[PDB]
Write a structure and sequence with these properties.
part of a larger assembly; 2 chains; A: 110 residues; mainly beta; 7 strands; 4% helix; 43% strand; B: 51 residues; little secondary structure; 0% helix; rod-shaped; DNA-directed RNA polymerase I subunit RPA49 (chain A); DNA-directed RNA polymerase I subunit RPA34 (chain B)
Chain lengths: 110, 51
């Protein structure tokens, strides 16, 4: 059975994280026209706030927002951990990195 | 300079931590079964007739 040699190159300080997105309303038919912007909290002194992040995705018609804090932050980001594996098919080596999962949702204000 | 959607993942790995089963010995009871009530040895009659 096909197998890969596992390596956690991972994050140098653990400060580095990749970014996974999941859309609450399904799959994006055209992810190529989306612009994602990652926002971080300016407060680096508060351990609670220093890991707060917002991911915004803008389309022509709607905006999506995901956050890793508050109601929008969901349980899967903690109870479980997410990683990204980059497999080199030639070497059979899989490099594994920490990942952060954002659940994306639509933007409207009264 | 922004973030763009990349190629779809080709596979998923789900990790869980699991221990294994031991041999079946099925040691039902310390002193097992319903041990039967029984005769005290010898006993002897504790009663006699008159005469």
């Amino acid at each position: 059975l096909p197998s890969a040699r596992w390596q956690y190159c991972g994050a140098p300080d653990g400060s580095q994280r990749a970014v996974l997105v999941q859309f609450s309303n399904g799959k994006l038919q055209s992810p190529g026209n989306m612009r994602f912007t990652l926002y971080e909290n300016k407060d680096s002194t508060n351990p609670r706030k220093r890991n707060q992040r917002i991911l915004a995705a803008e389309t022509d018609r709607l905006s999506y927002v995901g956050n890793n804090f508050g109601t929008g932050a969901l349980k899967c980001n903690t109870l479980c951990r997410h990683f990204v594996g980059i497999l080199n098919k030639t070497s059979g080596q899989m490099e594994v990195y920490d990942a952060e999962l954002f659940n994306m949702q639509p933007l409207f204000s009264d | 300079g922004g973030l763009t959607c990349a190629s779809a993942p080709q596979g998923t790995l789900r990790i869980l931590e699991g221990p294994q089963q031991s041999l079946s010995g099925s040691p039902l009871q310390p002193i097992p079964a319903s041990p039967p009530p029984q005769i005290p040895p010898g006993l002897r009659p504790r009663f006699c007739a008159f005469g």
